[PDB]
């Protein structure tokens, strides 16, 4: 019943005291955070409190969309020796700091995601050459489907790959994806290995990567410029915004204190120093 | 008029959408549908139909009749496997081309119990008992009867009832497994071993063969459609 938008408990008036009750004392040893209120130690007047936690509820903490990647595509001239670059990005929040740290506060979570795609383009060669408005395709290849090979092979016939066709110069594109985990919650951390090295086998085939699980494998996104070759080369970038919605979490962990290094929890040398200098005696 | 505002996504063609649109042939009289016998409602039903697994895909035997015939014999009793098979209903070449397999190539996560049925095809006079086993994954794949033995298995017995069915119960960590070759979500191993030996009287073919069938049980289901790797149009 107590919703997020409820007023915090009104602080009671309390006067002088000389009793055997000891509020003030604890023994953090138990592990219990001593639960005192202002009125417990000092004298308080009555106060009708109006502040509510409404803007810090799990929902609101993740309520902002966030950049997750920068995918590069381009459409060079047909005369060019280099091949028309189509980008393929594996879907993982771990590619950028920002969302990851916000997600790390929790061991597990269930969240239906909403993706937004802002696509910006530009010329490269200093030619007063033109280019007609381009049309992009963002194809979601789920784990195991054939990943595109050429900017123009069959794979793009999207028989079943849910795709999006975005014309440039229009409002950014957006799609909703429900919770797609193979579990009951997405694992932000996986302690263990996929393969158990067996006693009657080669170490090679018995070896995997620590903290690498399928739990967080979700296929790739394929992006290409649909318009064919154009005399004047035009590169473009596709920024992907992810905003977790209908979110819920489990088990708090301490926030990441030193610069992240790679997909694991691992850290690099030099970066292991977070706090600064300050004196024990200077306020 | 009515003040509105175009939000993110206006003009984005989603191949997977579900919006109404205009009609290109107003008032067309749709021809009424008859009752054609045999209407399918869901892909899973097709998956519940038995299909012969091509167990032997050896160099010479692949892509030729010999692929669906597992050859047993009247040799003396040994503790060696007759046939091995990774329970990867979509990634293992052996399962990959069966009906249950083919439907799986259009999904990302399969789930539920799978069943293996074997049909003996030798003489009426020949008899025996073969052990069909299912070991959940995570240990050395069984190589000697002994070990297969320890896991989930059914000891068949050849007779007047020509076919034996083994159910492979859904025992797995996740709640659906990756339809691809993945360790984390691996499936296990199925194996067949001579429990006794196949005995034949005199003047009877000494080497008869078996046929295998796979299919889904009532609790099987799949999800998240994807395109298939089982076809390609070059150019």
């Amino acid at each position, epitope marked *: 019943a107590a919703t997020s938008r409820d007023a915090l408990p009104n602080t009671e008036a309390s006067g002088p005291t000389h009793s055997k009750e000891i509020p003030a004392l604890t023994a953090v040893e138990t592990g219990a955070t001593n639960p005192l209120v202002p009125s417990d130690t000092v004298q308080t007047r009555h106060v009708v409190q109006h502040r509510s936690r409404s803007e810090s509820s799990i929902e609101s903490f993740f309520a902002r969309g966030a950049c997750v990647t920068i995918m590069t595509v381009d459409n060079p001239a047909s005369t060019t020796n280099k091949d028309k670059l189509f*980008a*393929v*990005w*594996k879907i993982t929040y771990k590619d950028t700091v920002q969302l990851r740290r916000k997600l790390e506060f929790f061991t597990y979570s269930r969240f239906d995601m909403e993706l937004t795609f802002v696509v910006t383009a530009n010329f490269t060669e200093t030619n007063n050459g033109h280019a007609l408005n381009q049309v992009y395709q963002i194809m979601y290849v789920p784990p195991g489907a054939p990943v595109p*090979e*050429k900017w123009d092979d069959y794979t793009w016939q999207t028989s079943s790959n849910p795709s999006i066709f975005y014309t440039y110069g229009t409002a950014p594109a957006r799609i909703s994806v429900p919770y797609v985990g193979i579990s009951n919650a997405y694992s932000h951390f996986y302690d263990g*290995f*996929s*393969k158990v090295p067996l006693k009657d086998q080669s170490a*090679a*085939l018995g*070896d*995997s*990567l620590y903290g*690498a*699980a*399928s739990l967080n*494998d979700f296929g790739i996104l394929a992006v290409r410029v649909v318009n064919d070759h154009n005399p004047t080369k035009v590169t473009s970038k596709i920024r992907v915004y992810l905003k977790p919605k209908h979110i819920r979490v489990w088990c708090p962990r301490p926030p990441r204190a030193v610069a992240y290094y*790679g*997909p694991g929890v691992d850290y690099k040398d030099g970066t292991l120093t977070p706090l600064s200098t300050k004196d024990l005696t200077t306020y | 008029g009515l003040p509105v505002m175009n939000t993110p996504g206006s003009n984005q063609y989603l191949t997977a959408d579900n919006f109404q649109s205009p009609c290109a042939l107003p008032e067309f009289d749709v021809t009424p549908p008859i009752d054609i016998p045999g209407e399918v409602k869901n892909m899973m039903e097709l998956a519940e139909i038995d299909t012969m697994i091509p167990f032997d895909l050896s160099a010479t035997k692949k892509n030729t009749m010999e692929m669906y015939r597992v050859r047993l014999s009247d040799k003396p009793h040994t503790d060696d496997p007759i046939l091995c098979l990774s329970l990867s209903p979509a990634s293992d070449p052996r399962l990959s081309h069966t009906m249950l397999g083919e439907i799986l190539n259009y999904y990302t996560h399969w789930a539920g119990s799978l069943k293996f049925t074997f049909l003996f095809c030798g003489s009426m006079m020949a008899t025996g008992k073969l052990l069909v086993s299912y070991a959940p994954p995570g240990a050395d794949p069984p190589k000697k009867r002994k070990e297969a033995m320890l896991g989930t298995h059914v000891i068949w017995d050849i007779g007047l009832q020509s076919s034996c069915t083994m159910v492979v119960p859904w025992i797995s960590n996740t709640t659906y497994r990756q339809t691809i*070759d*993945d*360790s*984390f979500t691996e499936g296990g191993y199925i194996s067949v071993f001579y429990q006794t030996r196949i005995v034949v009287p005199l003047s009877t073919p000494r080497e008869m063969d078996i046929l295998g069938f796979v299919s889904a049980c009532n609790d099987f289901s799949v999800r998240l459609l994807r395109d298939t790797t089982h076809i390609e149009q070059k150019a």
Partner: nanobody, 126 residues
Framework: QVQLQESGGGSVQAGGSLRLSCAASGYQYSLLCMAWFRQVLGEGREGVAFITTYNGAMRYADTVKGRFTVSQDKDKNTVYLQMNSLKPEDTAIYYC???????????????????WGQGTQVTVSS
């Protein structure tokens, strides 16, 4: 298709040290399992050392192990092969193959390798 632009052979004598560079063209990220090889003149076409793109873990061939070290240029998509202690028998047409990957499984020889390199030959004179 992934392209593997290799570089750059030569027949220096015993104990030598050269190196091969091979690009991802290609989309080096989580996929490719950049491996090394050398075709022992018609004998002959063995796998040297192979690196994992995702983590940077190397494994070598029982032959090359130690002298040869596989290096990785993550950001500029190149995988090197510091060919050390080049002895006469380090004469063979070098290779650079790169397959895909198993999400978490280490890049080994029994694993890859889908795509092929140029095959730039390095010979060790005698």
């Amino acid at each position: 298709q992934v392209q593997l632009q290799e570089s750059g052979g030569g027949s220096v004598q015993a104990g030598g040290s050269l190196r091969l560079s091979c690009a991802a063209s290609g989309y080096q990220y989580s996929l490719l399992c950049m491996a090394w090889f050398r075709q022992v003149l018609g004998e002959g076409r063995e796998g040297v050392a192979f690196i994992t793109t995702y983590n940077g873990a190397m494994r070598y061939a029982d032959t090359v192990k130690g002298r040869f070290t596989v290096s990785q240029d993550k950001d500029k998509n190149t995988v090197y092969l510091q060919m050390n202690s080049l002895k006469p028998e380090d004469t063979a047409i070098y290779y650079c193959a790169a397959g895909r990957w198993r999400f978490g499984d280490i890049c080994h020889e029994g694993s890859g390798y889908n795509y092929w390199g140029q095959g730039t030959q390095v010979t060790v004179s005698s």
